[PDB]
Amino acid sequence: SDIRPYDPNTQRRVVRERLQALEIINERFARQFRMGLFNLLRRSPDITVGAIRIQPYHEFARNLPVPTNLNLIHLKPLRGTGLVVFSPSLVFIAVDNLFGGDGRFPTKVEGREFTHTEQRVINRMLKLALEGYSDAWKAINPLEVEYVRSEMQVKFTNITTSPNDIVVNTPFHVEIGNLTGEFNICLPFSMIEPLRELLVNPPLENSRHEDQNWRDNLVRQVQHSELELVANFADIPLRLSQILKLKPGDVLPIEKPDRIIAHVDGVPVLTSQYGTVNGQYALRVEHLINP
């Protein structure tokens, strides 16, 4: 028997789920970003998509280097705030290539911050990155990507209510010539959660008309399914002691039921007034309990 003391703040919540739809969106975005980078840098980059990592937010934060450009982005209409992380190496490579450099010298990063010119270069790159990501998402679910803010430290973002929240991280590796760099795209699981059934199964070559026809027929098929409806006349609170002495012939007082709740497996569906019709216990339906 395994029995160990409960320790809070321990990484005990494990939620592993393959995300095929994200697995293809990543390659689509990588292809779009590669040509965007070719268009900008006038060079030939190769982007390798890494394995999607489903990890608590503080793991993602601690693995990041300091300083690193973080780009808070809004993936409307999905409520939340995603993050696009550009490594110092990648921005160094881009600035070197733009400003008359054939990347001859090795990239040197020693905690140096980002100037206004570097920030503008990163904004120019991030415009292409966001356009590519939006186009890639457009195939499955049309989303609009808005860049709201850029930061350099990790403690300024806090896109997760708690550091133990679970986020989805995709690291890409971009190589230009001999130089290499990496950049990540992190989405909080809260944003993805309404689209889990969409992001879980691999996409199929269908149409929106076919999809809506599918659930329509399924909805119609569901209607022909019998349910069990239970009407509760009264709910009287008695102690255990009363129940054991309880014996036939006793009278347990109850209050006036103005309305009668009808529930299916616990969930209330109807409130209706009791009655007798055709020798049967009947209910006059008064109100369907809408949410």
Binding site: R16, W214, N217, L218, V219, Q221, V222, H224, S225, E226, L227, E228, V264, D265, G266, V267, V269, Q273, Y274, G275, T276, V277, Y281, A282, L283, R284, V285, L288, I289, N290, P291
Partner: protein, 100 residues
């Protein structure tokens, strides 16, 4: 004579929408197979015996909600846990084919 006699409550009937009843638990059940068999072989059955099912092996399995057939799926194994993959909602024609 406490209960009041209700009658003539057949006002009308019209589907409202499928979200008034949404968060109501459904009893989903996947079915491996069927076989029509009489009591003759029924008691002949002992422990370790094998009963052949009418369903051919590898065919799509049946999915029911509260015992009502809605869809046909395919069985898959994910992380050592059994799972069905919904393939197609059945048609009224196959429903009656099933009935006969």
């Amino acid at each position: 004579a406490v209960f009041q006699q209700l009658g003539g409550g057949d006002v009308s009937g019209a589907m409202q929408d499928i979200d008034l009843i949404m968060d109501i638990p459904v009893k989903l059940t996947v079915e491996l197979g069927r076989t029509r068999m009489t009591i003759k072989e029924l008691l002949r059955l002992t422990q370790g015996s094998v009963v052949a099912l009418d369903g051919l092996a590898g065919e799509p399995l049946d999915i029911l909600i509260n015992g009502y057939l809605i869809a046909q799926g395919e069985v898959v194994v994910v992380a050592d846990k059994y799972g069905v993959r919904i393939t197609d909602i059945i048609t009224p024609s196959e429903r009656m084919r099933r009935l006969s």
